[PDB]
Amino acid sequence: AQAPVSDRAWALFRALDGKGLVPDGYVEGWKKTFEEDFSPRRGAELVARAWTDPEFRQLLLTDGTAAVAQYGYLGPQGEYIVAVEDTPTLKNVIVCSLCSCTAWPILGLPPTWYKSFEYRARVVREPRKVLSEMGTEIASDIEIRVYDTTAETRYMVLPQRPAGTEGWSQEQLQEIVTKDCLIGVAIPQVP
């Protein structure tokens, strides 16, 4: 038996706030960070830059932290970054099987599905079937590699750049790099 979750969450807030342990505007400030600042649009910007700038691509793949810091996008749950490169024979996918660990500042907070027991249990063992069910077909001639986020490394996938985007601006490329492309369950599509 439990009180409604909203009542329990606000009780926790009120118990701490009522003892002076929560600075003024504290939870409101975090809410703004979570809703407005942490965003997969940032990861998309990084990918589009890497796609159009071989030098940055090299930095991103060798020192992800430094590359992300150049854009000012390090942050909570995103202080040590490793980018993992898809290739014609390799598809990378990220999970946190133990909870929900995600590169928050550049991917945004994890979505419900990524935190689901279904994804946490299944993608490590049957990633091809999981991606297929989610709408992404990965051929047998492609190695699937699942990164389980079990420590402090926070990952992003650098997907392959699709044919048909040659010459596109960074802005145009950013639009096709979605949250799901950064997690690795989707491949960027030409609209």
Place this chain on the structure above:
Amino acid sequence: MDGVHDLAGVQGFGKVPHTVNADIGPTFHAEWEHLPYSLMFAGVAELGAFSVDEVRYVVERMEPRHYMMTPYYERYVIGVATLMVEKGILTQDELESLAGGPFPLSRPSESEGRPAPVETTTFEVGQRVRVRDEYVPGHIRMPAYCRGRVGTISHRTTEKWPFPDAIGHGRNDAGEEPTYHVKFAAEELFGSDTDGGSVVVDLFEGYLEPA
């Protein structure tokens, strides 16, 4: 801790509730949902009452049926509340009074944790390693699917962090270790019963030994 939270490889679950690029809705689906993370950070960064590792562990310590029936953000409301009570900052009485009803918490720890091991090895990219065949009842950042298994180092971190098995219990002896991206063949982890290629687990130095 071999709890129900160690889900990787568990069989019997249905479809992931998502198709690619589908609308996931707003970041928060209810007006309270930003509270668990924000209050976690108040506890960690403002009060210094606990580490993030202690938050992971207190969630692992939910009674197993309770864990399995509780949505994500609610688990962190329960976990943060539990730590506040365990650290003597709040009482369960006042939480229940303010909530207007029952506010069951995670179960007490059954382990005092363990220190960062004194004896470890610095590994290099390309080296073959085995995950120590050890059983730890308290917090550990080793999913069971890789226990005792052999893989290859693909990265050694250029930073070091406290050993989760210690800091996750608030111990003073967590030291600092780098972690290693250890690549395992899918078949090393699940035999023939997998459709994948490889799995890379980010493992603390103290979980590893030469192969």
